[PDB]
Amino acid sequence: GLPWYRVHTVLINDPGRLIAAHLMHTALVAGWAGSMALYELATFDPSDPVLNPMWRQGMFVLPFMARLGVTGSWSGWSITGETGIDPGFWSFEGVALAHIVLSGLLFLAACWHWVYWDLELFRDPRTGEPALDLPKMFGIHLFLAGLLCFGFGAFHLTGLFGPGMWVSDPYGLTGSVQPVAPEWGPDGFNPYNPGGVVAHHIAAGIVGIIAGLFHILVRPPQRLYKALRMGNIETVLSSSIAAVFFAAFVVAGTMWYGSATTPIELFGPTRYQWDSSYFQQEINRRVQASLASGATLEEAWSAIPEKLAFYDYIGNNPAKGGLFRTGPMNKGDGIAQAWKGHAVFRNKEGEELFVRRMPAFFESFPVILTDKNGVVKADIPFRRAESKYSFEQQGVTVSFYGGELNGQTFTDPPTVKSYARKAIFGEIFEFDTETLNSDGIFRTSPRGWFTFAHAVFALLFFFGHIWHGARTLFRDVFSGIDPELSPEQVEWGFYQKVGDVTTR
Amino acid sequence: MEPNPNRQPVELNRTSLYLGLLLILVLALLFSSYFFN
Amino acid sequence: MEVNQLGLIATALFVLVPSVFLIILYVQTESQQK
């Protein structure tokens, strides 16, 4: 009989039941989306978009609802921290319900197409055999995709007839859903310009419509029909799989490097913002602007938004996780409660000292303090017997500015050291580690998990493409080679042209 | 080896499968509260 | 809530083991000739 890994091949010449199987797959996927949104809503804490946003809580589909403009709950809250908002039907709950119902209807349709598989529509009118005119089907589907793409760009994203999309400032402080106008100049191909996403869907939509009409009206050239085996549905399987792993590599990439479609308020900051101290630089700039305007140190640092400070912390770096460290970031370092304020370290001579930050590569990292020129001034020693730079020897103190510890100063070596230890992670925060029994070990955000799954799936679908491309082009021999294969075909020099018997 | 003459084919018809599954699922729906306690 | 931590696996195996026993029996019945 059919081996286990081939059971689904019975669909190859049964368009009706193939459509049924596809209906069932689509039902399962819509059902997953609905279920996932319901589970996230049953676990999501909306009370603190500043220090407990969705990306800290292991939310995977909530940011995709938010990205396109679903930001409210029927229960009255919004992801931007508003209250008393009426989202209408299309709340998170509405979207989940919609997907569940869609799933049900697709199920029922699947049963219908499975039972009534033998529709005349699926029969070649000339031969009576099952047959699908794949080139014209491609035209039709490409036309429809074109229309949809165009409408999405022209009405949804523009806010013309629709909500728009999530946009924010360059430091993910004030994100919200806005109508976005298309960008038709070169900056449209800037991944951080949303106007380019708009212009993309409009232009690519129009192109898809035109091309779709072409593919409905013009038959394939015989040479390409033959070369690509356009009578065989598996050829479409191979090239589709190829298109799909291309698209998956792309979304993995833009998720990991960031773009207008992967906002940090929805997925968390990137690793490269830690690498380049993006946020630390902006914070320093603001504090400096404050001081130059006549503010005190305490005032200057107190003017720094907690959200901004929280971005400048390595616990939110997507490159600090573990493959089997499961769940939300909150399960690791805890639920962030408050900024402790900026730690300034000084030695007995009153020189400011700066803690060397942990790079993402390192699970553990030493505690080293330098002056403004990178000269080592203090550290926490391993071997003590020849220590020169211990905090005790150097009289290191820490004073806090802004945050909960604002205006305070600590001088006992243990406390100072504890704070230095936290300073290797960037800005220091108070965490609730009790609510979730957090274990103190860093986990990655949804940016990380999405990137991982999609780069992996992309790589596997490369093999899918290879396999089905092979199956397509070598259909004639995939049960074995010609039992009467003439030794002369594979001998050398018998034919002038390899495998061409007319060239003896 | 001589085949054993005492062998017998086994059957479970579809209606029996539905009854059985119903029995198991309803038993589970009943006892699970007590398993979680 | 503070539920029994083995409740989940107990319930899962309670369902799966006899359900699977029945599915095996059913399918091998259908595959018999006639």
Partner: peptide, 30 residues
Amino acid sequence: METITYVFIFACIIALFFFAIFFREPPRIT
């Protein structure tokens, strides 16, 4: 996870209703 279990079992029971009704072995007269 308790809630998920209860709802899972229930959902399976409804599914079973569907198959037992619409995909029953048809009664046939001899």
